[PDB]
Write a protein that binds this ligand. Structure first.
Ligand code: MG
Ligand code: MG
Ligand code: MG
Ligand code: ZN
Lengths: 225, 129, 249, 77, 64, 102
RNA sequence: CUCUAACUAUAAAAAUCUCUCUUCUC
RNA sequence: AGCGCCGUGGCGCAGUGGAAGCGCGCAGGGCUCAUAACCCUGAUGUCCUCGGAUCGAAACCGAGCGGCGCUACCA
């Protein structure tokens, strides 16, 4: 907290005076469209602020973007693409679980089932989807455990693979997020796999973007308004 | 929103020299990098709660100067290969941030955890202190 | 009266490096005087005392000596100095040593006048210290420039000139070079005599038959080098024509 | 010159005609003592071995290079 | 600055420290009585006393 | 002599087990004889739950917790008080020590 | 004769050691 | 015969410009049942002599003194 070797192998300026604030607007599918503000250096040509902004990522809880608390454990990543001025427009980037819920529902005496899939969406987006499921005690258990046989994991895992394949390849990322908000796909998986084993608390994990077509300016303009 | 200026505290709490390093929502633009060792003289009580508390208070003063009022804390440990365990200072830093006017929201555990990577340091019999 | 601090103000600044003199140890650490700043006591705590573990204390403090350290916090209201010995860079220790020696030389210089003319030491040092320390560096360079060309003492008027005359009375660098004569000529001693007569009219002497060593009493450290190279080039110019060859390395 | 003495035990004064680490290698095994090569600035190079084995040090200095045995005057101490 | 604080102990939490002379005490501040904090105190203490603190942010754990 | 019938390992039919590294002393140890504690903890203690609460938007927060599964060695575990050397006739009782908090 | 909740946090250094070992039936 | 170093407490350094400097040593004491280790206090002198400046000097310099490296026996 004093001095050090200083192996160099005043002229100070204020950090904030040359800095400026920008607003973030969410895709119209999300409920609370206003997200927040981000700090930028002041706009100077030859490295305008626009070049620095486009490409940034904003990391926001889904409960924030909907308002209710039932979406606390989810957490969406948004990608900065278009700069409007004092307000920037962001396209969907990814969506994830908070580590706490994931670590909470991975308990003992119930093996998990993971289902990874890499799928092109309707339009051009190459995406990766994870699915996490946990075995459920039927409400008559006297055996203290609910292990599943590897045949059952094989069946459930495959079924989830085609379920995600259909639900992604059919509809675009906007419609995908529309299914993602009220987690209809989760209950769909639970119903489609109900005949194999109870399978408590299925969920969609780490909706991960892989590839995007060019820019599709019109898509962004339709997204925000 | 109530016209709030959100931020992220994202405390990094090792077993030595607790870190407090606030940045914007984008995570790129840093504010108040002041750490625990900044505010203690021994260079060895850096992990002690006092260092983290003074660092957090100075961060809070800087945030009030720059307008950031409510925060989104991301508690982190060294994790990965090293012990997966939160340090003692970071929690005190979080509490000190809580006291000094600022508001909180969505505190997160962002501990980096491996899926058995990195044949790691120590040797067979490990530490022999 | 050894008083009247070396630098601009009595009270030390923040995070500043010093060397201190030890006088006593009560039980915790030691509040000991300072001979880098004003003589107000500065206290060292045992937590900040020894790089090695605390098992013997009388051997690492050595009461009654000079020790490098750095002052953490200063109380300029009524006078308390918080002083720290550990967090000092191994390269800044040399800085502390040289700065302490420089201040010691200043103290030694500006005591002779106060004791010869029995006037206040504080008054005379206050008069002298405005062009002394703050101009662009330490006093010693200014004093050397003044003895070779008096320009610093005249910046401000002293109480008198008798004290400055006593300073001049009390105050009142050699560079080596080797020249090897590789001559195979017949008469090459006359050229050496002529060239050294020209060069000397600063000090050039003999060691060996080819070896001539010049130890110039330069006053600027750069004038000596240029006179040295001028003499070397004169030697070469004189000797390469009459028949011989000489070399300097 | 080249004087050699042994003082309770360090050996001050050692010819350089053989490498020092092999001297230590033979010394430690033929004495069974802790061995140190301490190079104090510009004193007689320090080779220190524990115990009172000055007769054994005589044996070693005979067996390493020694063939004079006349300039060795070990102080009792 | 003079941010001196006062707190009344409501419960004595035994005695901590290798010396066996320092007491953990659960003191509720006289101002803002709804808040309580545990701190270490050297010297004899009994519940119902009111004690002085230079700092009130520091939470005191066991002294090892 | 036979100190424990189960050899103090709890392998008994696996031949070899994958080693795991201790959290503190970093010793490699068989995963079964790698005494394990589910450190499930609230991310802040009760001395700060208030402090955070009144300084919190979103009243009555869930206050998310931190979970970990500490894989100690045995030397650290016995030194760091996790496991205690019990008497001979009390070794054969493998239940957890009677409801830590009741 | 119906019951599945709460948690903390230390590893500084520490080597060596002489004799003299023998006695139970009424 | 010249210039550069050493200038002692039994010892090597150490500042040389406020006056007795460190460790190694040696004596005693402390520690422990005892020893080594560890922890304290000590007696050692002309830092060779001459001067100058110097309130103050072993030191800063200078005009002789005892030994070390070179020139190389420098007709
Ligand atoms: Mg151990
Ligand atoms: Mg045994
Ligand atoms: Mg076990
Ligand atoms: Zn361990």
């Amino acid at each position: 907290a004093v001095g050090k070797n200083k192996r160099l192998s005043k002229r100070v300026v204020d950090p904030f005076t040359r800095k400026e604030w920008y607003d973030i607007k969410a895709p119209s599918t999300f409920e609370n469209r206003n997200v927040g503000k981000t700090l930028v250096n002041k706009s100077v040509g030859l490295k305008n602020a626009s070049d620095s902004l486009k490409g940034r990522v904003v990391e926001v809880c889904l409960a924030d973007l909907q308002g209710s608390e039932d979406h606390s454990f989810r957490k969406v990543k948004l990608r900065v693409d278009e700069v409007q001025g004092k307000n920037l427009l962001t396209n969907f980037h990814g969506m994830d679980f908070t580590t706490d819920k994931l670590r909470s529902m991975v308990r003992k005496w119930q093996t998990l089932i993971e289902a990874n899939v890499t799928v092109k969406t309707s339009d051009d987006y190459v995406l990766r989807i994870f699915a996490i499921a946990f075995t459920r005690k039927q409400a008559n258990q006297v055996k203290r455990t609910s292990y599943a046989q590897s045949s059952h994991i094989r069946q459930i895992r495959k079924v989830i693979s085609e379920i995600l394949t259909r639900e992604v390849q059919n509809s675009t990322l906007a419609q995908l997020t529309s299914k993602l908000i009220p987690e209809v796909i989760n209950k769909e998986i639970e119903n489609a796999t109900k005949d194999i084993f109870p399978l408590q608390n299925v969920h969609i994990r780490k909706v991960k973007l892989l590839k995007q077509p060019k820019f599709d300016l019109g898509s962004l303009l339709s997204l925000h308004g | 929103d109530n016209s709030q200026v959100f931020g992220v505290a994202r405390i990094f709490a090792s077993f030595n020299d607790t870190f407090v390093h606030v940045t914007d929502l984008s995570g790129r633009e840093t504010i108040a990098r002041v750490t625990g060792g900044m505010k203690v003289k021994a260079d060895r009580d850096e992990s002690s709660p006092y260092a983290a508390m003074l660092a957090a208070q100075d961060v809070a003063a800087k945030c009030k100067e720059v307008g950031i009022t409510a925060v989104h804390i991301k508690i982190r440990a060294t994790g990965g290969t090293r012990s997966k365990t939160p340090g003692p200072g970071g929690q005190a830093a979080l509490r000190a941030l809580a006291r000094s006017g600022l508001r909180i929201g969505r505190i997160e555990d962002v501990t980096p955890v491996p899926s058995d990577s990195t044949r790691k340091k120590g040797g067979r019999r490990g530490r022999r202190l | 009266t050894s008083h009247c601090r070396f630098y601009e103000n009595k009270y030390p600044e923040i995070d500043d490096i010093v060397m201190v003199n030890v006088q006593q140890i009560a039980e915790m650490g030691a509040y000991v005087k300072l001979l880098e700043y004003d003589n107000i006591e500065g206290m060292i705590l045992l937590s900040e005392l020894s790089r090695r573990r605390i098992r013997s204390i009388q051997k690492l403090i050595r009461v009654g000596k000079n020790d490098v350290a750095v002052v953490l916090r200063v109380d300029k209201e009524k006078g308390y100095i918080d002083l720290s010995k550990r967090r000092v860079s191994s390269e800044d220790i040399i800085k502390c040593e040289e700065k302490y020696q420089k201040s010691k030389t200043v103290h030694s210089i500006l005591r002779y006048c106060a004791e010869k003319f029995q006037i206040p030491l504080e008054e005379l040092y206050k008069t002298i210290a405005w062009p002394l320390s703050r101009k662009f560096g330490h006093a010693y360079e200014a004093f050397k420039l003044s003895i070779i060309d008096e320009t610093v003492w005249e910046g401000i008027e002293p109480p008198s000139k008798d004290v400055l005359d006593e300073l001049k009375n009390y105050i009142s660098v050699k560079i080596r070079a080797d020249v090897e004569v590789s001559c195979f000529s017949y008469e090459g001693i006359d050229a050496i005599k002529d060239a050294l007569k020209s060069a000397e009219d600063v000090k050039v002497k003999l060691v060996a038959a080819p070896l001539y060593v010049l130890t110039t009493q330069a006053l600027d450290k750069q004038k000596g080098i240029e006179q040295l190279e001028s003499a070397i080039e004169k030697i070469t110019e004189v000797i390469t024509k009459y028949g011989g060859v000489c070399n300097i390395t | 010159s080249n004087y050699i003495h042994i003082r309770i035990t360090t050996v001050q004064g050692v010819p350089e005609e053989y490498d020092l680490k092999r001297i230590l290698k033979v010394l430690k095994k033929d004495f069974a003592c802790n061995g140190n090569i301490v190079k104090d600035p510009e004193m007689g190079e320090i080779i220190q071995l524990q115990g009172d084995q000055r007769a054994k040090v005589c044996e070693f200095m005979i067996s390493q290079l020694g063939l004079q045995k006349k300039n060795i005057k070990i102080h009792g101490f | 600055k003079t941010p001196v604080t006062l707190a009344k102990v409501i419960k004595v939490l035994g005695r901590t420290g290798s010396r066996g002379g320092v007491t953990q005490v659960r003191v509720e501040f006289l101002e803002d009585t709804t808040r309580t904090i545990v701190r270490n105190v050297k010297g004899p203490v009994r519940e119902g006393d009111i004690l002085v603190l230079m700092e009130s942010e520091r939470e005191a754990r066991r002294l090892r | 002599p036979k100190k424990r019938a189960s050899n103090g390992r709890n392998k008994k039919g696996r031949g070899h087990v994958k080693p795991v590294r201790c959290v503190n002393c970093s010793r490699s140890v068989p995963k079964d004889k790698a005494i394990k504690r589910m450190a499930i903890r609230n991310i802040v203690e009760a001395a700060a739950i208030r402090d955070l609460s009144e300084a919190s938007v979103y009243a009555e927060y869930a206050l998310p917790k931190t979970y970990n599964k500490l894989h100690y060695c045995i030397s650290c575990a016995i030194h760091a008080r996790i496991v205690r050397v019990r008497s001979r006739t009390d070794r054969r009782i493998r239940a957890p020590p009677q409801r830590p908090r009741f």
